[PDB]
């Protein structure tokens, strides 16, 4: 019964029992015991007066699982399927390519001058390793926007190239640099595709980009007979007339399609100049050039292991292969879009992938009243893998007490544990499969 529920609020790791002793000092016969608890599934039976009278513990040999599954205290005959089984992985493989230079991103970010937005510049970065964790937890940036990928995990990914785009933006038009925006900038100055993938950065620069007299070095194109397509550019400067025919000013309806502009030091928050940088991540399925810092390991063939070849994660059994990749192919796929093979980055070996063993387990019993004997059938597996996984506790579910004796037998449907083979034939009592039959019989 529950005597107390006490709000002490401390953590207890060790304890001492207190005894009494008497007159010189002596002792008297006394004994006590200790045991530990484990998180387990129990079944409870309530009597008509509301009192518990019995329990079973589902993890203490398979027959407990049979009773727990059928919600009974008695089972009569047959073969019953309770749950799946599988093998736990035993190790980890990490296999990034080897790269030794440091990304010079500062050559873009720390540049003294930015271009005019109408003619933005593009620079490529490749064959280097660097960490993104600086700009993530730093306050220098007025806004951080990332699409397709979360910024916390950029350190676990490999990219084939990075492209950095740079330009100056006016005031609050930072809202226009996003997918699906509309307006003079989003349609004439620059344009982002629908399936954009990358991060957008901005920071305020009134210290060097503005002055009281104003700086008038920047321009933007507000007039054009048609909106740009994604990442297009047009650096043409010509007289413009709404008729679509050439003319020369100061004649009628002759204009310049781009407007000169300037900032002021006393601009309000909605007006100061900002610098913007856009990073586009090319996840091309080819050899990666830029990667985050990780230590690699050796390979562990022919064992169930975790694997992280190049930003791809799973569990499986690695084996050599007879694939023949073309020099421009790095991955192979099956139907249902599952990865099937990969090129080892360090040595360009070709390696297959395959799953760790899995299947169903079912329990064969005679009547509970007659006896408590059981036999276990592991379906569609070679016994070598289950015996080598029962030992060293690699299988799950894990009984507290059980043993594979000398009785192991192989069948086409799988292999039986705990049943003795016999070189004689009888009529079937319980059919197993492929011609194998079982019964409960004298030795």
């Amino acid at each position, epitope marked *: 019964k529950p005597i107390f529920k006490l709000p002490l609020g401390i953590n207890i790791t060790n304890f001492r029992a207190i005894l009494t002793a008497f007159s010189t000092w002596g002792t008297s016969a006394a004994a006590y015991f200790v045991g530990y608890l484990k998180p387990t599934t129990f079944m409870l039976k309530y009597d008509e007066n509301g009192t518990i009278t019995d329990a079973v513990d589902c993890s203490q040999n398979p027959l407990a699982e049979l009773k727990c599954s059928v919600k009974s205290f008695e089972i009569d005959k047959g073969i019953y399927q309770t749950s799946n089984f599988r093998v736990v992985p035993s190790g980890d493989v990490v296999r990034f390519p*080897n*790269i*030794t*230079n*440091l*990304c*010079p*991103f*500062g*050559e873009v*970010f*720390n540049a003294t001058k930015f271009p005019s937005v109408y003619a933005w510049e593009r620079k490529k970065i490749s064959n280097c*390793v*660097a*960490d993104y964790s*600086v*700009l993530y937890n730093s306050t220098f940036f007025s806004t951080f926007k990332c699409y397709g990928v979360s910024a916390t995990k950029l350190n676990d990914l490999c990219f084939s190239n990075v492209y950095a785009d740079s330009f100056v933006v006016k005031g609050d038009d930072v809202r226009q640099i996003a997918p699906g925006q509309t307006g003079v900038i989003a349609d004439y100055n620059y344009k982002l595709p629908d399936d954009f993938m990358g991060c957008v950065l901005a920071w305020n620069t009134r210290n060097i980009d503005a002055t009281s007299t104003g700086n008038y070095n920047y321009k933007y194109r507000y007039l054009r007979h048609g909106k740009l397509r994604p990442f297009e550019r047009d650096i043409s400067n010509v007289p413009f007339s709404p008729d679509g025919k050439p003319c020369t000013p100061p004649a009628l309806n002759c204009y310049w399609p781009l407007n000169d502009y300037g900032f002021y030091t006393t601009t309000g928050i909605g007006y100061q100049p900002y610098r913007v940088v856009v990073l586009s991540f090319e996840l091309l399925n080819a050899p990666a050039t830029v990667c985050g*810092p990780k*230590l690699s390991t050796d390979l562990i063939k022919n064992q169930c292991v975790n694997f992280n070849f190049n930003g791809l994660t799973g569990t499986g059994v690695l084996t050599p292969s007879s694939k023949r990749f073309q020099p421009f192919q790095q991955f192979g796929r099956d139907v249902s879009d599952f990865t099937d093979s990969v090129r080892d980055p360090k040595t360009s070996e070709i390696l297959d992938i395959s799953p760790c063993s899995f299947g169903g387990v079912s329990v064969i019993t005679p009547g509970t009243n007659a006896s408590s004997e059981v036999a276990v059938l592991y379906q569609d597996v070679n016994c070598t893998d289950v015996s080598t996984a029962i030992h060293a506790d690699q299988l799950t579910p894990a009984w507290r007490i059980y043993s594979t004796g000398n009785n192991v037998f192989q069948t086409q449907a799988g292999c039986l544990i705990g049943a003795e083979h016999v070189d004689t034939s009888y009529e079937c009592d319980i059919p197993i499969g492929a011609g194998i039959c079982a019964s409960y019989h004298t030795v």
Partner: antibody
Amino acid sequence: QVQLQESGPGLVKPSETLSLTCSVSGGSISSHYWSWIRQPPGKGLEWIGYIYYSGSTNHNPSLKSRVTISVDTSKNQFSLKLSSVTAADTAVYYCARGVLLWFGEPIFEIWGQGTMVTVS
Amino acid sequence: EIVMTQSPATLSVSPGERATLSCRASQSVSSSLAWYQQKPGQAPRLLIYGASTRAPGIPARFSGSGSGTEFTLTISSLQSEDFAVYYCQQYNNWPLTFGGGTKVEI
């Protein structure tokens, strides 16, 4: 991979000029910073200056007049000359490539074998 | 302008027990210190560039930590090959400065 190798005279008379050259192989001067360092005997390092592509150059906030530095894209070489040289200027001199990560100054990642020069 | 000092001036240790070196600076910096190793008659090498980031190919036993004005380098499981002089340099500000270094004595 790249290799930095440097050459120059071993001895300079007082109130004369010293000059050194350092030169590249395996690659060519393009997008990285290039730096001159010296180590006086038994003492901590000193940074004299660095120059990068397109001629832009940086020097120590002192000794500004004691040196000028030049870079030639042609023949993959760069050089310095010292306005004056004294006994206390003896050191091992190094050329090294500087890489800039994000902000601030560059980290010196690849080092030249260096050479010992003295006055007498 | 940042000025730099490193302590102590000398250490000695025997094989298999860890030791730590510390260098201090006059004003706040963040993740702007690099650790250099030098061996008799050889050019330096880069071990740690980030605040706590191993340069590529540096043995896994090297590590360091710090922020603000205090930083420390931890060397564990020392082997005779680890005999060297060590320096710390900061690139956060425009002027470039290297520490006075510390001699580790066999």
